[PDB]
Design a protein around this ligand. Structure first.
Ligand SMILES: [Cu+2]
Ligand SMILES: [Cu+2]
Ligand SMILES: [Cu+2]
Ligand SMILES: [Tb+3]
Ligand SMILES: [Tb+3]
Ligand SMILES: [Tb+3]
Ligand SMILES: [Tb+3]
Ligand SMILES: [Tb+3]
Ligand SMILES: [Tb+3]
Ligand SMILES: [Tb+3]
Lengths: 147, 147, 148
C-alpha cells in the first residue's frame, strides 16, 4: 500500500535530513512528522516545515521574516502557504496533514523553514552585513513533487 | 524546630545534589523546592522531582517515558505518584508540598526525575541505538524515608 | 526632524550596546527597541530595559530581584519604574514607548536590566555559598538617560 507520510528532522546545524519528497497520487492526505534533534531552544534555532510552489517561496520567506518570531515567522493567512507545521525548538515534535488535492502534477513545489535569526559571523553584537540574513531557507529547503 | 522542607538542584550533567531525603515525623507537610542550574532548556534537559515507593518506581518511570514531553513525562493521574513537581528547565523553580500522612515509617521510597530525551552519541546531527535511552532516572534518583 | 527612538541590544556577556541615551525635548514620545543577540534562553540570560531616576534605581533592582522570574524581575505596580520592556531571551524583541512629559530636564535618570540569575563561578555544576549572592545584570547592564 501507498506511503502517505514522511518523517523529517531539523537540527542545530540548519539542516533537514531530506532534500526531496515525492508524494504518491493515490494518497488522499499527506502527513509530515517534524522533529528537532539538538540542544538550542526554539527562539534561537527554531524550525518549521512549510510548503509553497517554487515560484512563491521567496515571497513567503520574506514576509515570514518580516512577521517575526511571535507569528512563527509566517505571514498570517498567507494564501501561498499550502501547509505548515508550527515552529519547534530542540526536543519538540509537530505534525501537519494536508489534502493531496491541493497539489497539481507537473507543478514544482518547495518545502523549507522560514525561521530567520540573525547570525553573529564576527563580537557579541549584530551589525553591518549580519543584518542581511536569508534565514534558514537558504540551507533548509528541498523539492516536493506529486507523481 | 523541625525542618519540613528541602532545597534540591538538578543540573545539566543529569545530577541531583542529594541522594537521600529523611523526612521528620513531626512534620505535617513536607515541601521540595526544586531548582535547575545550567544553560539547557526544559525540552532538552528538563527535570522534575517525583516520589513513589521503591516498588512502584520502575512502573512510573516507564509509563512516564511513554507519556512523553507534552505530559511532563508522567502518566496523567498516576496513583503510584505520591507527589511531584512540574517539569522545569534551566533558570526555573518549582515547589511541591505533600502531606506526611501519605508516608509510612518502615516503607522504602524513591525520588527521581522521569525526563527522557534523546542523546546524539555519534555527533552526526541526527537521532538514529540513540532511540533507546534509560532517561534521567538512571542517574537522577535517591532514597526517601520517614524517621 | 528629531530622532525619538533608539535600538538596543543586550547580549550573552551581560552588556547593552549603549551606555547613554539623550532624549530630544521636541519628542512627544520616546521608543526603545530591545533585541537580544546570543544563544542563551530567557530564564538563564534574560534582559529587560527599565527606566527610573538615579535615586530610585537601587530600590527597583532590589525589589525586582526579590520579585523573581515569574514577575519578570520587577515589583508589580512599581511607581518608581517610568517605563520598561518585558523580559526577553535570545532571539526575541520587545519595544516600549513612553511620554517624554514624564521626564524633567536637570533630573538624573538611569536605564538598566533587573534580571538576576545565579553564576556558577567554581564550575562544579551547583549554586552554593557566595554564588547565592548576585548583584544581577544591573551591575554591568546600566547607563544614563538625560533630557536635553
Ligand atoms: Cu529552521
Ligand atoms: Cu531530569
Ligand atoms: Cu539582563
Ligand atoms: Tb505509513
Ligand atoms: Tb557581530
Ligand atoms: Tb522551616
Ligand atoms: Tb482518572
Ligand atoms: Tb546521531
Ligand atoms: Tb526615527
Ligand atoms: Tb558552584
Amino acid at each position: 500500500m501507498a506511503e502517505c507520510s514522511v518523517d523529517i528532522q531539523g537540527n542545530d546545524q540548519m539542516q533537514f535530513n531530506t532534500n526531496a519528497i515525492t508524494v504518491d497520487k493515490s494518497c488522499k492526505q499527506f502527513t509530515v512528522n517534524l522533529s528537532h534533534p539538538g540542544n538550542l531552544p526554539k527562539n534561537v534555532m527554531g524550525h518549521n516545515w512549510v510548503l509553497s510552489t517554487a515560484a512563491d517561496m521567496q515571497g513567503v520567506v520574506t514576509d515570514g521574516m518580516a512577521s517575526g518570531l511571535d507569528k512563527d515567522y509566517l505571514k498570517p493567512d498567507d494564501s501561498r502557504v499550502i501547509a505548515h507545521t508550527k515552529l519547534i525548538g530542540s526536543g519538540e515534535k509537530d505534525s501537519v496533514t494536508f489534502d493531496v488535492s491541493k497539489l497539481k502534477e507537473g507543478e514544482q513545489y518547495m518545502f523549507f523553514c522560514t525561521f530567520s535569526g540573525y547570525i553573529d559571523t564576527n563580537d557579541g553584537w549584530i551589525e553591518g552585513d549580519e543584518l542581511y540574513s536569508p534565514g534558514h531557507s537558504a540551507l533548509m529547503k528541498g523539492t516536493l513533487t506529486l507523481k
